[PDB]
Enzyme design. Structure first.
Site, PDB file in Angstrom:
ATOM      1  N   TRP A 112      10.781 -10.338  -4.732  1.00  0.00           N
ATOM      2  CA  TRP A 112       9.349 -10.129  -4.492  1.00  0.00           C
ATOM      3  C   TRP A 112       8.622 -11.449  -4.628  1.00  0.00           C
ATOM      4  CZ3 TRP A 112       7.879  -6.262  -1.665  1.00  0.00           C
ATOM      5  CH2 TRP A 112       8.690  -5.114  -1.648  1.00  0.00           C
ATOM      6  N   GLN A 170       1.005  -3.078 -12.099  1.00  0.00           N
ATOM      7  CA  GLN A 170       1.259  -2.591 -10.733  1.00  0.00           C
ATOM      8  C   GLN A 170       1.172  -1.060 -10.759  1.00  0.00           C
ATOM      9  OE1 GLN A 170       3.034  -1.072  -8.251  1.00  0.00           O
ATOM     10  NE2 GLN A 170       3.939  -2.542  -6.796  1.00  0.00           N
ATOM     11  N   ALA A 171       0.382  -0.487  -9.863  1.00  0.00           N
ATOM     12  CA  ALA A 171       0.032   0.918  -9.830  1.00  0.00           C
ATOM     13  C   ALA A 171       1.227   1.872  -9.789  1.00  0.00           C
ATOM     14  CB  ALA A 171      -0.861   1.171  -8.609  1.00  0.00           C
ATOM     15  N   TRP A 172       2.301   1.538  -9.098  1.00  0.00           N
ATOM     16  CA  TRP A 172       3.437   2.445  -8.908  1.00  0.00           C
ATOM     17  C   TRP A 172       4.344   2.469 -10.129  1.00  0.00           C
ATOM     18  CZ3 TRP A 172       4.327   5.590  -4.549  1.00  0.00           C
ATOM     19  CH2 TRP A 172       3.492   5.342  -3.451  1.00  0.00           C
ATOM     20  N   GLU A 220      -0.020  -3.346   7.127  1.00  0.00           N
ATOM     21  CA  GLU A 220      -0.011  -3.494   8.586  1.00  0.00           C
ATOM     22  C   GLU A 220       0.867  -4.633   9.017  1.00  0.00           C
ATOM     23  OE1 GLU A 220      -4.503  -3.769   8.387  1.00  0.00           O
ATOM     24  OE2 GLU A 220      -4.211  -2.516  10.197  1.00  0.00           O
ATOM     25  N   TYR A 221       2.068  -4.726   8.454  1.00  0.00           N
ATOM     26  CA  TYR A 221       2.919  -5.885   8.645  1.00  0.00           C
ATOM     27  C   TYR A 221       3.297  -6.143  10.104  1.00  0.00           C
ATOM     28  CZ  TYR A 221       3.740  -5.489   3.482  1.00  0.00           C
ATOM     29  OH  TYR A 221       3.680  -5.421   2.115  1.00  0.00           O
ATOM     30  N   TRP A 253      -5.869  -0.878  -2.867  1.00  0.00           N
ATOM     31  CA  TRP A 253      -5.030  -1.583  -1.916  1.00  0.00           C
ATOM     32  C   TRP A 253      -5.441  -1.237  -0.473  1.00  0.00           C
ATOM     33  CZ3 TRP A 253       0.939  -1.320  -3.008  1.00  0.00           C
ATOM     34  CH2 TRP A 253       1.228  -1.504  -4.371  1.00  0.00           C
ATOM     35  N   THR A 311      11.410  -3.446 -10.512  1.00  0.00           N
ATOM     36  CA  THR A 311      11.951  -4.296  -9.458  1.00  0.00           C
ATOM     37  C   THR A 311      11.823  -5.777  -9.776  1.00  0.00           C
ATOM     38  OG1 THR A 311       9.916  -4.299  -8.123  1.00  0.00           O
ATOM     39  CG2 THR A 311      11.450  -2.511  -7.748  1.00  0.00           C
ATOM     40  N   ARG A 350       1.948 -10.026  10.006  1.00  0.00           N
ATOM     41  CA  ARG A 350       3.030 -10.955   9.760  1.00  0.00           C
ATOM     42  C   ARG A 350       3.777 -11.262  11.062  1.00  0.00           C
ATOM     43  NH1 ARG A 350       5.633  -8.398   4.200  1.00  0.00           N
ATOM     44  NH2 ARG A 350       3.839  -8.945   2.794  1.00  0.00           N
ATOM     45  N   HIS A 410       1.536  -7.023 -11.294  1.00  0.00           N
ATOM     46  CA  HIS A 410       1.238  -7.147  -9.878  1.00  0.00           C
ATOM     47  C   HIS A 410       0.694  -8.526  -9.560  1.00  0.00           C
ATOM     48  CE1 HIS A 410      -0.757  -4.831  -6.264  1.00  0.00           C
ATOM     49  NE2 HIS A 410       0.217  -5.644  -5.849  1.00  0.00           N
ATOM     50  N   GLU A 441       5.614 -12.816  -6.976  1.00  0.00           N
ATOM     51  CA  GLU A 441       5.507 -11.777  -7.987  1.00  0.00           C
ATOM     52  C   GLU A 441       6.701 -11.746  -8.941  1.00  0.00           C
ATOM     53  OE1 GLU A 441       5.511  -7.151  -7.249  1.00  0.00           O
ATOM     54  OE2 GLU A 441       3.458  -7.938  -7.290  1.00  0.00           O
ATOM     55  N   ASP A 465      -5.052 -11.431  -4.082  1.00  0.00           N
ATOM     56  CA  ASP A 465      -4.692 -11.076  -2.725  1.00  0.00           C
ATOM     57  C   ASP A 465      -5.922 -10.697  -1.906  1.00  0.00           C
ATOM     58  OD1 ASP A 465      -1.928 -11.288  -3.465  1.00  0.00           O
ATOM     59  OD2 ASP A 465      -1.413  -9.297  -2.610  1.00  0.00           O
ATOM     60  N   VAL A 466      -5.881 -10.894  -0.575  1.00  0.00           N
ATOM     61  CA  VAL A 466      -6.995 -10.509   0.274  1.00  0.00           C
ATOM     62  C   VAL A 466      -6.914  -9.083   0.766  1.00  0.00           C
ATOM     63  CG1 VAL A 466      -6.009 -11.232   2.489  1.00  0.00           C
ATOM     64  CG2 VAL A 466      -8.490 -11.377   2.122  1.00  0.00           C
ATOM     65  N   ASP A 467      -5.721  -8.464   0.762  1.00  0.00           N
ATOM     66  CA  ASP A 467      -5.453  -7.131   1.356  1.00  0.00           C
ATOM     67  C   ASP A 467      -5.802  -5.986   0.424  1.00  0.00           C
ATOM     68  OD1 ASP A 467      -3.188  -7.901  -0.236  1.00  0.00           O
ATOM     69  OD2 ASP A 467      -1.904  -6.482   0.805  1.00  0.00           O
TER      70      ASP A 467
HETATM   71  C1  LIG Z   1       8.166   3.900  -6.925  1.00  0.00           C
HETATM   72  C2  LIG Z   1       8.247   2.979  -5.699  1.00  0.00           C
HETATM   73  O1  LIG Z   1       9.302   2.659  -5.184  1.00  0.00           O
HETATM   74  N1  LIG Z   1       7.080   2.577  -5.174  1.00  0.00           N
HETATM   75  C3  LIG Z   1       6.895   1.653  -4.032  1.00  0.00           C
HETATM   76  C4  LIG Z   1       5.999   0.470  -4.372  1.00  0.00           C
HETATM   77  O2  LIG Z   1       6.666  -0.339  -5.347  1.00  0.00           O
HETATM   78  C5  LIG Z   1       5.678  -0.325  -3.112  1.00  0.00           C
HETATM   79  O3  LIG Z   1       4.750  -1.382  -3.446  1.00  0.00           O
HETATM   80  C6  LIG Z   1       5.272  -2.700  -3.321  1.00  0.00           C
HETATM   81  O4  LIG Z   1       5.934  -2.978  -4.576  1.00  0.00           O
HETATM   82  C7  LIG Z   1       6.524  -4.317  -4.633  1.00  0.00           C
HETATM   83  C8  LIG Z   1       7.294  -4.422  -5.944  1.00  0.00           C
HETATM   84  O5  LIG Z   1       8.332  -3.421  -5.939  1.00  0.00           O
HETATM   85  C9  LIG Z   1       5.355  -5.321  -4.539  1.00  0.00           C
HETATM   86  O6  LIG Z   1       4.468  -5.216  -5.682  1.00  0.00           O
HETATM   87  C10 LIG Z   1       4.572  -5.077  -3.228  1.00  0.00           C
HETATM   88  O7  LIG Z   1       3.421  -5.941  -3.164  1.00  0.00           O
HETATM   89  C11 LIG Z   1       4.086  -3.624  -3.164  1.00  0.00           C
HETATM   90  O8  LIG Z   1       3.444  -3.368  -1.898  1.00  0.00           O
HETATM   91  C12 LIG Z   1       4.987   0.605  -2.090  1.00  0.00           C
HETATM   92  C13 LIG Z   1       4.662  -0.139  -0.792  1.00  0.00           C
HETATM   93  O9  LIG Z   1       4.030   0.772   0.124  1.00  0.00           O
HETATM   94  O10 LIG Z   1       5.936   1.657  -1.779  1.00  0.00           O
HETATM   95  C14 LIG Z   1       6.248   2.518  -2.927  1.00  0.00           C
HETATM   96  O11 LIG Z   1       7.166   3.509  -2.487  1.00  0.00           O
HETATM   97  O1  LIG Z   2       0.824 -14.269   6.490  1.00  0.00           O
HETATM   98  C1  LIG Z   2       0.306 -14.272   5.400  1.00  0.00           C
HETATM   99  C2  LIG Z   2       1.027 -13.762   4.175  1.00  0.00           C
HETATM  100  C3  LIG Z   2       0.264 -13.712   2.944  1.00  0.00           C
HETATM  101  N1  LIG Z   2      -1.104 -14.037   2.925  1.00  0.00           N
HETATM  102  C4  LIG Z   2      -1.867 -14.110   1.620  1.00  0.00           C
HETATM  103  O2  LIG Z   2      -0.944 -13.837   0.558  1.00  0.00           O
HETATM  104  C5  LIG Z   2      -1.220 -12.532  -0.040  1.00  0.00           C
HETATM  105  C6  LIG Z   2       0.089 -11.838  -0.462  1.00  0.00           C
HETATM  106  O3  LIG Z   2       0.755 -11.283   0.703  1.00  0.00           O
HETATM  107  P1  LIG Z   2       0.670  -9.721   0.959  1.00  0.00           P
HETATM  108  O4  LIG Z   2      -0.646  -9.197   0.471  1.00  0.00           O
HETATM  109  O5  LIG Z   2       0.994  -9.505   2.406  1.00  0.00           O
HETATM  110  O6  LIG Z   2       1.870  -9.147   0.039  1.00  0.00           O
HETATM  111  P2  LIG Z   2       1.982  -7.566  -0.404  1.00  0.00           P
HETATM  112  O7  LIG Z   2       0.851  -7.338  -1.403  1.00  0.00           O
HETATM  113  O8  LIG Z   2       1.806  -6.749   0.849  1.00  0.00           O
HETATM  114  O9  LIG Z   2       3.341  -7.505  -1.053  1.00  0.00           O
HETATM  115  C7  LIG Z   2      -2.105 -11.838   0.994  1.00  0.00           C
HETATM  116  O10 LIG Z   2      -2.945 -10.816   0.444  1.00  0.00           O
HETATM  117  C8  LIG Z   2      -2.923 -12.979   1.584  1.00  0.00           C
HETATM  118  O11 LIG Z   2      -3.955 -13.344   0.652  1.00  0.00           O
HETATM  119  C9  LIG Z   2      -1.784 -14.458   4.045  1.00  0.00           C
HETATM  120  O12 LIG Z   2      -2.970 -14.806   3.975  1.00  0.00           O
HETATM  121  N2  LIG Z   2      -1.068 -14.513   5.233  1.00  0.00           N
HETATM  122 MN   LIG Z   3      -1.193  -7.770  -1.146  1.00  0.00          MN
END
Ligand SMILES: CC(=O)N[C@@H]1[C@@H](O)[C@H](O[C@@H]2O[C@H](CO)[C@H](O)[C@H](O)[C@H]2O)[C@@H](CO)O[C@H]1O
Ligand SMILES: O=c1ccn([C@@H]2O[C@H](COP(=O)(O)OP(=O)(O)O)[C@@H](O)[C@H]2O)c(=O)[nH]1
Ligand SMILES: [Mn+2]
Ligand SMILES: O=c1ccn([C@@H]2O[C@H](COP(=O)(O)OP(=O)(O)O)[C@@H](O)[C@H]2O)c(=O)[nH]1
Length: 287
Positions: A233, A166-168, A279-280, A275, A178, A284, A199, A236, A144-146
């Protein structure tokens, strides 16, 4: 050949999960001997690849910080090639790279829905593996780039197939994960099954293995489209189904992809990647 005990000491981190039931290491700070590995892989003269996508305003928000940090911290001491996929090359930040880094950039089509931008990476990565990455590198990461590299992300992370915790969720029970829970989806994982919650922001392996990861995930993404269902998701969910069936040969601890919104608890000893804040509303353009 390399032996696990040559470089991996689980006893350095006795209070976290360091080995899986199928004998893969879970790499935590303290467990790895990077010097031993740097010497080993330098004698093999390896090159490591890194793919990253930035489509739309993800370019302005995240790509420079991602690449600047990768240049500093990713596989230092080894040749690396950054593969950058963007929809608009005129918005590419062309930063200065350091020793043993180089790059190349590809123009891709922007999918109309952000969900498809994310999922279509699986198709595009496999096309690039067949066309060139298989001939260029020994190992590849797909990221991912973010997110931003914060410290050394080195050869201790290399392996045949590499997954990220995945950290959480790393301390959670599988029935709380999930995963996709609808049987109509190719990504379905039933209650009572699962090892970890991986993740999709980081995965990697040899080009051969990453080709299989990405091809199988994209097959599931397409099958779901034909059955009018979209996994909770997105890519993922499919990646977690893949790694349930085809266990990773190495897993990275949450230190390798940490969300500081959690805080910084005792188990997270040295963060290698963090992370970016979501900034959705800006980055987006559809729900
Ligand atoms: C414990 C809990 O609910 N934590 C959530 C995180 O899971 C959430 O992160 C997102 O998680 C989904 C999978 O569930 C996916 O991996 C997304 O990329 C990731 O951002 C986080 C988001 O801010 O909120 C916590 O509350
Ligand atoms: O409009 C878009 C949506 C996704 N991405 C690419 O796809 C990845 C996964 O999406 P995002 O990181 O938004 O998912 P999240 O980690 O927030 O669930 C991003 O990091 C980008 O590399 C992008 O470039 N533009
Ligand atoms: Mn991401
Ligand atoms: O063109 C479309 C958009 C959606 N749907 C179905 O439900 C999924 C949701 O479609 P999406 O908008 O994500 O379009 P696509 O990936 O086909 O470009 C599609 O793949 C189809 O199977 C439809 O029948 N046709």
């Amino acid at each position: 050949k390399l032996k696990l005990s040559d470089w991996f000491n689980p006893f350095k981190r006795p209070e976290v999960v360091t080995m899986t039931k199928w004998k893969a290491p879970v790499v935590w700070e303290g467990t790895y001997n990077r010097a031993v590995l740097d010497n080993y892989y330098a004698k093999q003269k390896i090159t490591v690849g890194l793919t990253v996508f930035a489509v739309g305003r993800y370019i302005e928000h995240y790509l420079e910080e991602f690449l600047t940090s990768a240049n500093k911290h990713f596989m230092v001491g080894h040749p690396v090639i950054f593969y950058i996929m963007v929809d608009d090359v005129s918005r590419m930040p062309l930063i200065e790279l350091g020793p043993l880094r180089s790059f190349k950039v590809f123009k891709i089509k922007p999918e109309k829905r952000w969900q498809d931008i994310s999922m279509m990476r699986m198709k595009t990565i496999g096309e690039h593996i067949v066309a060139h990455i298989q001939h260029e590198v020994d190992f590849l990461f797909c990221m991912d780039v973010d997110q931003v590299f914060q410290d050394k992300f080195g050869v201790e992370t290399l392996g045949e197939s590499v997954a990220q915790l995945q950290a959480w969720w790393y301390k959670a029970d599988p029935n709380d994960f999930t995963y996709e829970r609808r049987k109509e989806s190719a990504a379905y994982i039933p209650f009572g099954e699962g090892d970890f919650y991986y993740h999709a922001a980081i995965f990697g392996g040899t080009p051969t293995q990453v080709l299989n990861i990405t091809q199988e995930c994209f097959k599931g993404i397409l099958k779901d489209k034909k059955n009018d269902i979209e996994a909770q998701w997105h890519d993922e969910s499919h990646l977690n189904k893949y790694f349930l069936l085809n266990k990773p040969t190495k897993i990275l601890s949450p230190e390798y992809c940490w969300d500081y919104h959690i805080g910084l608890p005792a188990d997270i000893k040295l963060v290698k990647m963090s992370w970016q804040t979501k900034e959705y509303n800006v980055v987006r353009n559809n729900v």
